Design a binder for these strands. Structure first.
Ligand SMILES: [Mn+2]
Ligand SMILES: [Zn+2]
Ligand SMILES: [Zn+2]
Lengths: 1402, 49
RNA sequence: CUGUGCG
């Protein structure tokens, strides 16, 4: 028995590291003889090794005396009140800065994350407690997934673990101590652990009761003939009660005249009648302040240089006199303005008794003069300076300090063109004699009628881009207002020079919240005033041409109509008015109205629509501008969809569908988060209060009354009285009938449809730790926000088990396409085939798929299936049972707003349902904190099981329709929306018997309602157009949906590294070109992105974006190919030679002499030499000295930009939009580039160091590609700024070679350059060498074979070694990113005319 | 038999239809589309007359 | 302990 003890003592005596505290614990360990205490002391030794390793790795003092936070605060003399008692692992004191360390080890990921989040929570609580006593603390957590350390070797530690396990083979320790619970916990902590059925199953009678509830009344073992008989008799009864009138019909035949007359009569009580386009243009150009500003007919710089210079040195805090420093800055800017105005220049940064000082704030001249006089007087009270020498001296002092602060960072102050002569000896007098006497700037909240406007409201024709230009300037002014710091007139001000004038957007409030802006002008004072939200005016910031071009394309779609030619100009005016209205007034209601327009036009070109379609399309409009948008939409539909058009309905339908998808131009964010959160809670709760199960405070240890209510509601959910009842079916009511559920399960069974933290025990409610507590959040969408049920890691694993089970079940079938791309492509092909043959297509959406579904419904449909080949299914059943008894945390903001409203109502009005709920709960004392209910399928947490249920139910419903009529119905679902493709028989039935067809569709609706499949009013039964997964098909072709992609491109601008931003925009533009968007509009989108980057003063590189593409580089070209085309356009001479040598190399590599084995080594030497070496090895003429010095400024040469070593080893490790642009402009303006000495500097310093060289030239091609030609004489000579430069020909060769390896050898060929309604669905023809199975393919083997150290740190023959070699050393792009980070695009639907204007190459 | 028997520009006409190179049009549509150009706005080829 | 960048 003691043999293993003695041997392991020998091993831990020989292999242990030499330490002094470890020796003390050792001498305390070797003296004991009891085996249990040996186990305890061994685990203590391991824990102490872990602790001291963490402490010496983090540089903190080890806390071995179990000293809590109060002890550390008392040993230093800081008296604190009763706070939380927390004992950390280590503490580090540096003045008022404490560093706290807590370490732990966990084997399971769920327990690891549980301990991580509880440690995070307690650390934040301790931080909040320590800020109340004014002590700064920083958290640190050390969670170790393994038991390794740096004192005992690995294999001897494993032997120690094995001998401890072998000493647990005995039973004396088991009956002496270590009770079953603690023994199991210890054995699991020592073990190395998809179902985990080794749980203490103590499911009470409640499980069996709920299971019996899923069985009683349901047969699930009927015959394939008996089910058909029941379905036929039920259809007979339903059709009888429908022809009588006892069952209301839901589907109306589409009358285009009546549909338009119903749409025009929308908001009849608030909109007068039909309006002409002329009256609309009249009321539009003067509708709202932002729209009055547009169409208004409104007709060096020493002050600006000084203002910029002082704005640069205001953040470095050159003096601890914030107010006095601001005063000195105002005085300097006044001096600069006077020196500017005396020479020749007019007032530029002036507005009248108010000037734009540093920190973009308006400062009044009178207050400035008064404060400066007071300051200089007080300084003269102490003592001679004649009231002017003191000011001159203090100005010299501050300017010297600022120049020294700009010198050590390398700004080279002479870069600002300061011209420091404004500091005159008579500075104080020159300031005191300053008198402008201009117009007073104000804001004027709650302004008056348009007649109080300074300029002429409305002169700009809606054919020029001047309105879009003004909108862009104003939007950029708002987004720049978003970034004011507001330290300490008080109003701040941004400036946007439009034409011959410089307007100023004034605002007093700071931050990205919705505030009140005032557009002012120096010549007329305040021009406009409007309460706007700045974080919503992004998508028009620089898209002055993008929007004009998308409007032009949408108009050219219907231009050759020969019946709109008399109204084409009016249609163009209406389109541009709608666009400028949704861009100058981004409101959620306008977005919802445009989505409802989408649904309306989808139901307009069909045969049958839902009777409640117009009820869903009509959404409440406020602000009198959304009514203007509705009137514009009504007029546009009256012109495009007039009675007398009847020509190219496809083009007009596509045009109006894009007019509807214009809603994406409005940002998908929330206007105010509290109201939309309350709305999401309403959407989540109202079905529950309408059903009758709203049990609050679930009381995790479930009470008998709660379970009784749960099973009663489970039995109520299965009643769903069908058409055989007295009153009839109650549509849109949550619940599934026993009859139809039994029919579904029976037809599926026979071959007719398919033919201290770990949980120890678990019951019918939860695993003894939590009944799946979820948190309710809202997800930003364009029309209306979606729900999100976010759960902890354990609930995540349980839902993942359920979803994997049901995803396997669905994959065993072949109907559903939600996470199966092959099935989605088959669905798209079948949809094209069914639409091209003009077969009836039923585009169904299911209203309230989340709130009305039920985990109990899935449990019941599971308990009744057989699944002929019990463990595995019992675990799935108890998981769904847990999902039934699920808690959802009401958001604290929602409950806080409800409590505030309750207080306001009890102290101080047709309250809503949720309001009455909260009030009735508050009046009895209970606060609603969690809402346990049965009628809630999580929006996403049960996506796979919901998809499987939708699949089997739609299969059963189509089988029923086919057995009762005689026509097959293909179905393809996405768990929320589906499409049913009817065969020739049902189409001929509609053509010959519309009443029987509408009766069949009413039976389909009623049968879907007999399950939890309420068919939404957005559903459309049309034999021409078909919608599925936001894919619209007209006649076998596809709707481009141009505006959707254009808005997605103008919106997605993140605050990440600029090259990643460029990659993202390039992928979006690739999708845009793929679906419908022409090449010119995408070139303009890329130019807009480059302009966004140029505004951040970023040195645009050739490896950013190609804005001269010709629809040849998107269809069959990677991003590397587009950048190569750009570089070819840059240097048309050297790139020719490089392409020649690369063609010869590819020829000699693919089918020639072995070169790949040593090319990997050749790509690691100096590029300048290797170029000529390769050209001589191949015999081709090498590039000349002039055509080889071309280089590009790579800011991320030594280290990447710190947007607050190769990069490929980092991409495999896997706020708002306007705030993203603000952060991008702030980071690219601050110290973002890193140096070789691990020091940060500004980009301005790098431009200065470049200008501090006589070699570089800075020659841009046409749009600022900004490629340099630094000579070879100074190339990396004495560690100059040239280290940031990277040779351009070397990178071009790398990119061209990698592209040749990717997509054919035609790329090396010399480029021989050679009605907007035709498309060509072609494919990306490319014999790729990067098979799509490359997720973790042999690339990792090559990484480990060439970079072993890089394979160890930050990590964890085939023609692929070159692909990994051409990016680890040739740091230009990733060159492998569309296979592991992005995804490739196929089936390019591009314009055929733009294919003939393309370039070609051998 | 080339696809369905409808006026590709109307979506409504099913009687008295003329045949294009690969689909059908209506008489009203044929007289209305011949006023802009001879090329078919659908299949991009001259319309028969 | 922050950006001054649209004619
Ligand atoms: Mn759909
Ligand atoms: Zn026609
Ligand atoms: Zn044709």
């Amino acid at each position: 028995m003691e043999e293993d003890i003695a041997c392991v003592k020998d091993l831990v005596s020989k292999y242990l590291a030499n330490n002094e505290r470890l020796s003390r614990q050792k001498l305390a360990f070797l003296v004991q003889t009891e085996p249990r205490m040996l186990l305890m002391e061994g685990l203590k030794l391991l824990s102490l090794c872990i602790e001291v390793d963490s402490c010496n790795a983090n540089g903190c003092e080890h806390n071995s005396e179990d000293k809590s936070v109060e002890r550390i605060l008392h040993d230093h003399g800081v008296l604190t009140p009763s706070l939380c008692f927390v004992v950390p692992d280590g503490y580090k004191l540096t003045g008022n800065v404490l560093i706290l360390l807590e370490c732990f080890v966990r084997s399971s990921p769920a327990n690891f994350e549980q301990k991580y989040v509880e440690d995070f929570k307690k650390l934040e609580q301790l931080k909040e407690d320590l800020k109340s006593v004014d002590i700064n603390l920083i958290p640190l957590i050390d969670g170790r997934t393994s038991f390794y350390n740096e004192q005992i070797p690995d294999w001897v530690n494993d032997k120690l673990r094995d001998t401890l396990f072998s000493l647990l083979k005995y039973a004396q320790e088991s009956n002496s101590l270590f009770e079953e619970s603690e023994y199991s916990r210890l054995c699991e902590s020592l073990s190395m652990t998809e179902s985990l059925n080794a749980l203490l199953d103590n499911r009470s009678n409640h499980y069996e009761e709920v299971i019996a509830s899923c069985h009683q009344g349901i047969n699930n073992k009927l015959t394939a003939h008996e089910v058909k008989l029941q379905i036929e008799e039920e259809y007979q009864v339903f059709r009888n009660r429908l022809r009588k009138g006892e069952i209301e019909g839901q589907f109306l035949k589409v009358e285009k005249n009546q549909l338009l007359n119903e749409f025009n009569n929308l908001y009849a009580d608030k909109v007068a009648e039909k309006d002409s386009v002329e009256h609309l243009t009249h009321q539009f150009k003067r509708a709202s302040p932002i729209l009055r500003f547009l169409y208004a007919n409104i007709s060096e710089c020493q002050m600006q240089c000084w203002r910029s210079f002082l704005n640069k040195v205001k953040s470095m805090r050159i003096l601890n006199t914030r107010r006095k420093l601001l005063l000195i800055f105002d005085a300097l800017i006044l001096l600069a303005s006077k020196h500017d105005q005396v020479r020749k220049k007019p007032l530029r940064g002036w507005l009248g008794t108010c000037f734009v000082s540093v920190n973009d704030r308006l400062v009044s001249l009178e207050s400035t003069k008064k404060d400066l006089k007071k300051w200089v007087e007080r300084r003269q009270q102490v003592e001679c300076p004649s009231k002017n020498q003191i000011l001159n001296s203090i100005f010299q002092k501050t300017i010297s300090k600022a120049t020294t602060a700009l010198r050590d960072v390398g700004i080279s102050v002479d870069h600002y063109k300061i011209d420091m002569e404004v500091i005159c000896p008579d500075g104080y007098d020159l300031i005191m004699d300053f008198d402008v006497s201009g117009v007073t700037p104000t804001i004027s909240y709650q302004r008056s009628e348009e007649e109080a406007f300074p300029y002429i409201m409305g002169d700009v024709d809606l054919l020029k881009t001047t309105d879009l230009e003004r909108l862009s300037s104003l939007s950029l002014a708002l987004v720049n207002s978003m970034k004011t710091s507001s330290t300490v007139k008080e109003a701040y001000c941004q400036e946007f020079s439009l034409g011959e004038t410089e307007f100023q957007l004034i605002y007093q409030k700071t931050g990205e919240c919705s505030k009140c802006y005032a557009i002012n002008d120096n010549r007329v004072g305040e021009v406009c005033s409007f309460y706007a939200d700045p974080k919503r005016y992004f998508p028009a910031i620089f898209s002055a041409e993008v929007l004009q071009t998308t409007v032009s394309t949408m108009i050219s779609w219907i231009e050759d109509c020969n019946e709109l030619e008399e109204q084409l100009d009016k249609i163009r005016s209406l389109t541009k008015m709608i666009l400028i209205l949704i861009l100058a007034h981004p409101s959620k209601r306008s977005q919802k109205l445009l989505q409802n327009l989408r649904y309306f036009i989808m139901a307009y070109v069909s045969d049958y629509y839902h009777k409640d379609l117009i009820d869903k399309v009509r959404e409440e409009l406020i602000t009198d501008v959304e009514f203007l948008l509705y009137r514009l939409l009504r007029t546009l539909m009256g012109l495009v969809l007039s009675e007398d058009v009847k020509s190219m309905m496809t083009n007009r339908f596509k045009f109006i569908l894009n007019i509807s998808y214009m809603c994406h131009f409005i940002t998908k964010e929330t206007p105010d988060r509290l109201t939309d959160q309350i709305k999401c809670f309403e959407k989540f709760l109202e079905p529950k209060v309408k059903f009758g199960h709203v049990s609050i405070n679930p009381a995790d240890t479930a009470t008998e009354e709660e379970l009784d209510d749960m099973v009663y509601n489970a039995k109520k959910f299965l009643s769903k009285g069908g058409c055989t009842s007295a009153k009839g079916p109650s549509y849109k009511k949550p619940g599934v009938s026993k009859k139809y559920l039994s029919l579904l399960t029976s037809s599926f069974n026979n071959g007719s449809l398919f033919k201290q933290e770990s949980p120890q025990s678990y019951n019918s409610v939860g695993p003894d730790t939590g009944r799946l507590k979820f948190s309710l959040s809202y997800k930003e969408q364009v029309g209306g926000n979606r729900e999100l049920y976010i759960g902890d890691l354990r609930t995540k694993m349980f839902t993942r088990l359920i979803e994997d089970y049901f995803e396997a079940l669905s994959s065993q079938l072949s109907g559903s396409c939600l996470n199966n791309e092959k099935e989605f492509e088959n669905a798209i092909l079948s949809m094209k085939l069914n639409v091209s043959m003009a077969h009836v297509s039923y585009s169904m959406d299911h209203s309230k798929w989340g709130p009305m579904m039920c985990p109990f419904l899935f449990l019941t449909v599971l308990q009744n299936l057989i699944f002929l080949s019990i463990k595995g299914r019992d675990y799935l059943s108890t998981l769904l049972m847990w999902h039934m008894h699920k808690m959802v945390e009401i958001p604290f903001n929602v409950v806080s707003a409800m409590m505030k409203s309750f207080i306001k109502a009890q102290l101080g009005t047709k309250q809503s349902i949720t309001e009455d709920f909260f009030y009735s709960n508050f009046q009895i004392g209970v606060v609603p904190s969690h809402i346990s209910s049965i009628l809630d399928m999580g929006q996403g947490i049960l996506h796979n099981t919901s998809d499987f249920y939708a699949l089997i139910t739609e299969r059963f419903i189509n089988y029923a329709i086919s057995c009762v009529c005689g026509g097959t119905i293909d179905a393809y679902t996405s768990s929320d929306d589906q499409i049913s493709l009817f065969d020739q028989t049902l189409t001929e039935l509609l053509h010959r018997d519309p009443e029987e067809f509408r009766a069949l569709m009413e039976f389909h609706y009623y049968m879907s309602d007999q399950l939890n499949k309420f068919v939404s009013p957005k559903s459309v039964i049309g034999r021409f157009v078909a919608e599925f997964k936001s894919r619209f098909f007209v006649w076998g072709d596809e709707v481009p949906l141009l505006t959707k992609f254009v808005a997605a491109a103008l919106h997605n601008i993140k605050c990440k590294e600029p090259h990643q931003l460029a990659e993202t925009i390039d992928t979006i533009v690739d999708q845009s070109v793929a679906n419908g968007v022409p090449v010119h509009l995408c070139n303009l989108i890329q130019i807009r992105t480059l302009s966004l980057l140029q505004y951040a003063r970023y040195p645009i590189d050739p490896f950013l974006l190609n804005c001269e593409t010709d629809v040849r580089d998107w269809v069959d070209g990677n991003r590397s190919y587009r950048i190569m085309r750009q570089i070819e356009g840059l240097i048309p001479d050297a790139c020719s030679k490089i392409r020649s040598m690369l063609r010869r190399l590819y020829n000699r590599l693919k089918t020639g002499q072995l070169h790949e084995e040593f090319t990997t080594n050749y790509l690691s030497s100096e590029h300048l030499s290797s170029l000529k070496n390769l050209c001589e090895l191949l015999g081709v003429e090498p590039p000349s000295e002039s055509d080889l010095e071309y280089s590009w400024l790579n800011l991320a040469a030594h280290h990447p930009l710190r947007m607050v070593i190769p990069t490929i080893v980092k991409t495999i490790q896997n706020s708002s939009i306007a705030s993203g642009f603000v952060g991008l402009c702030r980071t690219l303006g601050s110290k973002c580039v890193r140096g070789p000495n691990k020091e940060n500097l500004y980009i301005k310093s790098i431009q200065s160091l470049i200008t501090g060289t006589q070699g570089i030239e800075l020659l841009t091609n046409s749009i600022g590609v900004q490629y340099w030609r630094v000579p070879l004489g100074l190339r990396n000579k004495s560690e100059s700024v040239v280290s940031y430069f990277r040779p351009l020909l070397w990178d071009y060769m790398c990119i061209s070679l990698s592209t040749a390896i990717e997509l054919g050898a035609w790329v090396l060929g010399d480029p021989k350059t050679t009605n907007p309604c035709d498309y060509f669905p072609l494919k990306p023809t490319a014999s790729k060498l990067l098979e799509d199975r490359v997720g973790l393919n042999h690339i990792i083997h090559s990484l480990r074979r060439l970079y072993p150290s890089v394979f160890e740190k930050h990590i964890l023959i085939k023609f692929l070694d070159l692909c990994v070699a051409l990016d680890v050393n040739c740091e230009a792009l990733s060159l492998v990113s569309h296979i592991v980070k992005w995804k490739r695009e196929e089936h390019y639907i591009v314009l055929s005319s733009e294919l003939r204007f393309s370039h070609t190459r051998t | 038999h080339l696809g369905p028997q409808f006026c590709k520009s109307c979506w409504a006409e099913n009687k008295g239809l003329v045949e294009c190179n690969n689909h059908y049009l209506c008489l009203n549509c044929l007289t209305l589309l011949l006023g802009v150009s001879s090329r078919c706005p659908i299949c991009k080829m001259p319309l028969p007359t």
